[model samples]
Target chain A: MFNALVVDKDEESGKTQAAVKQLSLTDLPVGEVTVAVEYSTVNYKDGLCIGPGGGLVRKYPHVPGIDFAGTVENSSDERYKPGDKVVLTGWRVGEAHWGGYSQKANVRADWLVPLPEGLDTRQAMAVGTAGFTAMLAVMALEDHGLTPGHGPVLVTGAAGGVGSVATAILAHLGYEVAAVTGRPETADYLTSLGATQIVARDEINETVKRPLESEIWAGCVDAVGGAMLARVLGQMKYGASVAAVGLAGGAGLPATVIPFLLRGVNLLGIDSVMQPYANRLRAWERIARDLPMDKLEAMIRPATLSDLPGLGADILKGQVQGRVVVDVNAH
Target chain B: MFNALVVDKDEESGKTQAAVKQLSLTDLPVGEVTVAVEYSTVNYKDGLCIGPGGGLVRKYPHVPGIDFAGTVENSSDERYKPGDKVVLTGWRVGEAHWGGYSQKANVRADWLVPLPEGLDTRQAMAVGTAGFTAMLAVMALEDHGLTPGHGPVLVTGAAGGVGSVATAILAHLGYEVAAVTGRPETADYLTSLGATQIVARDEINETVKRPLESEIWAGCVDAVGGAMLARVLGQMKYGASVAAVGLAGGAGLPATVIPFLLRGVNLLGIDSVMQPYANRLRAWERIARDLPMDKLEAMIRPATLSDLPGLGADILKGQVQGRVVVDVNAH
Candidate 1:
């Protein structure tokens, strides 16, 4: 038996409650690899799954961490051994099935990528789905021909996990970084992560009033979709791209195609889950090399299984800052 | 003096009129290259400039054929020689300056590309900006890893200029093609252009009620960019892309970001104007190699300079179909 944070639905109210609970080894979903999960991280979708379910969780008593890093304790698959270290992200693991909120996680062997060299289990969890997605956004921009001298790259939701990591990575790549955030207090925190400029949310996040704005952003890694994504689309430099990663802002994209046809702008979708195996491996390796370890350490907000319910609710309301690393084994 | 169709505005009535007129060689805008224009094509914008100016024409007495193919009559630039075959499509040629609806034309040598050897000036005019943009969209899809045998590629506004050419080019590339058109009568026309499936516009064009629909189209080249683009964004197969080129419907994209974040769909903007010289060269070569001559001939709607006033008004009213190549030299 092991301890896990599980969310159970109440039949009377149709509401769900999450708490520390016990899980048997067999309670985990059937899969070829079983990991003794050392660390997990909180993401925006994790907030949805942990609290109101966001229609993401399917079964009750669900474990709700979208990403985790651990060591394999057992495996039926030839690709992995008992002592092998690994990490998991995507493949709809947390939402549709049992996930790594528990001390032990059972998953399909193919979903796990070997922990990249130069990073330990704790360090890997520090660079969790939020960081991984930030790396994917960076890669997408680069693939679309983004270079340093073009203009300032905008990272929306800049003080949060995805924005924090994206700001660090883009800044490290020698690009000018413009960070957007609702909370003004995090400006110093963002600057430490290499963001060169701070943009207030009320200033940049709004519905499309003008179909075209003065060209401002060279590229963007957008965690705040909805109106912000729509507004930012018009602001991209000619031939620039915006990578759509999350919708913390909202889901409705009230946009116009004027910028697209007139300026050759692009909106690239970045999904961490269900990524092909090759891309997962590549992204993880890139995270190890591109994301500065010092910046990753600064973004770490340490927590335990007991703190998840409060943290999960916090992230949903846009209160949490940076990445929250959950130590599953911690009391 | 040479014959040109020029639009002159009546200051009293605030109405613009177009007719064949005489212009001296000195009347052409100053540039390094002068060509005896062989053929020019009418695009939707040409409809605007030809009739009541849709604000694209900045000055009165304007010439407004957006694209043309011809032989060089003279050149002050080393890049061109007298009698060299050339084609021009972009760089705000028709709207902001003296354009292609003339027996003689002048433009920056930088704005012209050598016509591909296999394509004559008439065939090149058939391909024009509409066909060039279609090729760009195809290239965008191909560069993003689209290949044949996935599923049906959709061409929206299929009976129109861009859509007709896109349908032909994509089908020739070995992909299954679904053509969307408002005119049911054009079913045979689109079928002759290599479309395997015909989708009625009423069936597919609407505001998105659901953020996502059943994944259907493998890829899309969209000329109708209002509710249809929004609806199509929801219908893209996972990881598929839609290349946006025009806004024949409306410009508002009433979409949801859920499809992008959840499904990894991309919206790539394809603008033929302001394209780099390298891309123009590549696209021209691709067009020459990929677009079938037999299919190109099927899309031709031949005309002369004298017919443009009616042709332009007819196109604005959606009566014009296929390509309209205006032979400026033909009385």
Candidate 2:
């Protein structure tokens, strides 16, 4: 028997609840590789899967963690073997299939990436899907001609998981980082993570009145969508790009085409879920190289399997300050 | 004295009127180079400049053609000499400065590109600001990894100047072109320009309720903005781009950030005015090489200075089809 967090729904009330349960290997669905999960991380989606499912979890009595890093226990595929370190993110694992909120997980061999040289199981989970996605956003911007010397780069929702990591990575890459956060209390923390400037949420969170504003950020990693994103679009420098990473603020973008037509700006969409294997590998390699270890360590908050439900809820409410890495076997 | 089409506004009534008038060369704006204008073209902006100025013309008694191709009459700048062929497309010519609807024009030497080989003054004017912007849009898409085999490339407002040129060039470059138009009567014309598919304007001219739809177009050249652009964003294939060139439909983009976050789509803004000199030269070279003369000839409708007022008004109503080449030297 192995320990895992199981989420079950009451058919009558439709209320979902999470609890740590013991299960055998046979309980896992069909897969080519088995992993002894060392650490996992809580993301906003984790909150949804742990609580009411948010329409993301279609099945009940499910394991609920979207990202994990660990050592392989066994493998039927040539790509992985026992004791090999691996990581998993996306592929709809937690919502549609059993996931990493467990001591053991079975997944298709193709879904696992070999853990990069510089990262361990714990460190990998510390980066998690949020940080992985942050890396992808940075890389996307770079692909679109974003360089460090261009100008200041904006990281919206700067206290959140993706924003925090993106701020750190961009800063480490020699970019002047401007971090935007609603929580003023975390300004010092964000500054410590390499943010050179702190812009208050109210300053950028309103619906845009004008389509074009003074050219400001050279590039941006926008996690807060909605009005904030619309406002940000107008503030980009001529020919700059904004990588759209999340929708923490809202979904509606009441904007004008003026910024694009007048400034030659670019709004690049970023999807971490279904990203191809080549890009995943590229992002991981970059994260391994450019993401400063000390800055990443500063962002980590350690937890255990029992801590997940509360942590998940905290993330959903935007109360979580930084990354929460769960050591599944602890306690 | 040389003949030119000039627009003058009434001080008290704010009414604007356009007429062909004879003016001495000394009446032209002071600049480093003077060109003996041969041919100019009518665009949507030209219509506004010819009529009430649409706030695009800031000064009265303005010569109003945004693009022209001619031979150098004189030069204080070392880059040009008398009889040298040159083309001018942007730099806010008709709007903020004295422009091309005249037998002679004075402009800063930096505003002119030495006429690319294989394109004459008449041919260059046929592919004026509209075609220049179209070439820039295609180049932007190609820079972002778009290729001929990716899938169908969409050219919105395909009957208009930018759309017509974009459809032809994209088709000539081996792309499957899907031309979007409200006027079904122009379907045959668009097809002749290499549009393999014709998408009805009604099909893509509404606000999309859904954030994400089935991925369709690999790329798009959007001359029409507003709800049409919002709808098209949902229809783009993963990693595809939409080069936003104009807002012929409207300006408001009532969109959701969902397409960007979920599908990895891109919105690239294209601006013809104030473009960097290097890119202007490159686009002109590409147009000369790729935009078939036969196709460009098919689009050309010749006019004289006397025809400017009527042609300009017709473009504002979207009544002008294809290119309108104005022969400034014509009596």
Candidate 3:
């Protein structure tokens, strides 16, 4: 028997529940690679999936976690073999296919990234989808000539998973990290993650009203969209960029083109899902090498399969902090 | 005596006007290089200076033409000598210093573009600042991996100077041009400039309620900002970019962060006024070889000193078709 966190919603009633099910490996969905999951973590999308259906879950009974790290037990594809360690992120595997919420997961071999040297399965999961995304944001900025000497780099929603990881990575790369958070109580938490400076989210919230302001940040990784993204665009230094990652603050952007035309600013979009295999691998390699493990361990809070339902709600309410690695095998 | 078109605005009253004066070369604004001006071009900013005062002309008695081509009469800088033909576009010449509105003018040697082998002074100004900006937009897009085989390239504000020239250059380079314009009456005008297809300005002004939409455009040169630029952001294909050149529509961009994050779209700002010397030279060199002389001639409309103010008003209204090349020596 294997433990799996399955999300189900009634189509007519608009009711939903997340429950742990004990099932045999024979019942697992078919794919080219069968993995014995070592670790899996929750992201913002995963929290949404556990609720009354954000339409992110197309099917009734769905696995919602977007990332997992494990050892491959079987593979129909020539790229893998038994006992091969691997990581999985992106490729719509979690929402559409059986994800890593379970003790075992079946997915295409093409979706698997062979665990790079210096990173074990649990460590890989610590640097899961959020960490992977952070790396990609950094890569995109670096590709556009964003460096430590350019100026201070801003990380909006710095208390969250993606922002936290992005802040850490940018700091590790010698960049001055300006961490923006709504909660003043998280000052120490942000500083612990290597934030050289802490800024109130309200400052950014108010500033986006201008089309072109003083040239400030050399680059930015923004999770909150809407007016905040719009405001940040006006403040980018000449030839700089902003990598848009999430819409936690709403999707609408009331911005201006003056900053872009007048200052040569670039707005680069970053999507982790559907990210190419090479890019996925690169992000993972960066996470494994750069992410501070002790700090990652400090941020991590372990939970059992039974803890998921309540934790999922807490996550949706923005109460959860750091990584929540589901220990499905404990049950 | 040489003729000069100078714009003066009252500081307190904000009343702005341009005056045509006969000033000797000795009275021209101080600089290292002196040129017998052969040609000058009226830009949108020049129009604003002559009309209601676009606020670009800072001082009274400042020449209004931002771009000019002529033969050097004298030079203290090693870059030029008497009889050497040259072109000058930016370095705040028209606004902060004396520029080409006069038959003979003194200007900085560093701002000179050594009129390359493939073109003459008159033909160079015929292409003028607008064509130079168009080349810069194309270069920015192409430098970011845009190619002809990708898909149709869109040029917003198709009947304007930059848009018209961009259309011809893109089409000549084998790209399928989809020109966007508000005036459906000018559809034939754009088509004659080598636009493969025409898209109405209204069609591109889609208000995106969602974070992002299905990827559409392969590449774009957006002259109109504001709501039009916002809509274009969502329509860009994966990994595509829009080179934003002008704010003809408006400066505000009501856009979301969704397109940047989800599609990897790039919005590259094009700044012609402060473009680096190497880039400026490269653009001019491309114009000399790539932009077909016959097509450029077909798009050219003749204008003299007397017609400047009215033509400036017309160009801002988007009524002007193609380029307006001024015969500065005519008077």
Candidate No. with top DockQ: 2
Ranking by TM-score: 1, 2, 3
lDDT of 2 by residue, A1-331 (tens): 9899999899899998898989999999878999999999998789989988988888889999999999999999998999999999988889898999999999988789999998988889889999999999998888878987878999999998999899999999999999999999999999999999999999989965677889999999998899999999999999899999988898888889999998999999998988778878989999999899889999999998888889888888889988989999896
Candidate 3 Cα misplacement greater than 4 A, ranges: A207-209, B10-13
Interface RMSD of candidate 3, in Å, is 1.2
Please list all clashing residue pairs in model 2, or write none if there are none: none
**Every model's TM-score on chain B:** 0.98, 0.98, 0.96
Q: Score the docking of each candidate (DockQ).
A: 0.89, 0.90, 0.80
The local distance difference test score of each candidate is 0.92, 0.91, 0.82
Model 3: residue A146 alpha-carbon error in angstroms? 1.5
Higher-ranked by TM-score: 1 or 2: 1
Residue-wise lDDT of candidate 2 within B1-331, one digit each (tens)? 9899998899999888899999998899899999999999998889989987887888898999989999999999999999999999989998899888999999999999999998999999999999999999999999888998888999999999999999999999999999999899999999999999999999889985778888889999999989999999999998899999988888899899988988888999999998989988889899989999999998999999889889888888778878999988875
The DockQ of predicted model 2 stands at 0.90
B126 Cα displacement, candidate 2 (Å): 0.8
Q: Enumerate residue pairs that collide in model 1.
A: none
TM-score against native, each model = 0.98, 0.98, 0.96
Residue-wise C-alpha lDDT for candidate 1, range B1-331, written one tens digit per residue: 9999999999899898899999999988888999999999999888888889887888888988888889999999999999999999978888998899999999999999998998999999998899999999999999888999999999999998999999999989998999999999999999999999999999988875779899998999999899999999999999999999989888899999988998999999988999999988899899988999999999999999989899889877767778888888885
Native-to-model Cα distance after best TM-score fit, residue A251 in candidate 1, in Å = 0.7
TM-score of chain A of each: 0.98, 0.98, 0.95
lDDT by residue (B284-307, candidate 3, tens digit) is 999988799988987888988878
DockQ of candidate 3 (2 decimals) = 0.80
RMSD of each: 1.2, 1.4, 2.0
